[PDB]
Amino acid sequence: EYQNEKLANELKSLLDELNVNELATGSLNTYYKRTIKISGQKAMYALKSKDFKKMSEAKYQLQKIYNEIDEALK
Numbered sequence: 001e002y003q004n005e006k007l008a009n010e011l012k013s014l015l016d017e018l019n020v021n022e023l024a025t026g027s028l029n030t031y032y033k034r035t036i037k038i039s040g041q042k043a044m045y046a047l048k049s050k051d052f053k054k055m056s057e058a059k060y061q062l063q064k065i066y067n068e069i070d071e072a073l074k
Contacts, residue, residue, distance in 0.1 A: 003052065004050070004052050004055075007052060007055045007056060007059065008047065008050060008055060010059060011043060011046065011047050011055050011058060011059050011062070012047060014043065014059060014062050014063065014066070015040070015043055015044060015047065015062075017066075018036070018040045018043070018062075021036060021065075021066055021069055022036050022037065022040065024069060024073060025069060027073070028069070028072045028073070029072075032065070032068065032069055032072060035065050035068075036065050036069065039058075039061045039062050039064070039065045040062065042058050042061060042062075043058040043059070043061070043062045045058075046058035
């Protein structure tokens with residue numbers, strides 16, 4: 001149960017910076033805005049599903065776009 005709770009907490013933390021990251025994409029190619037909305041929505045559903053596999057995949061996908069955004073903002 002620890003891993004499931006740990007992942008839920010981690011995904012919640014990533015989602016806590018979803019809005020700020022989405023706002024940040026305003027200065028980037030519209031690809032980033034569209035992609036973060038999609039990944040953000042999927043991550044939100046995953047967190048409310050509380051399913052490990054859905055949350056794992058959502059963490060991976062959300063971290064991916066966050067990383068791409070961070071690189072793009074440099």
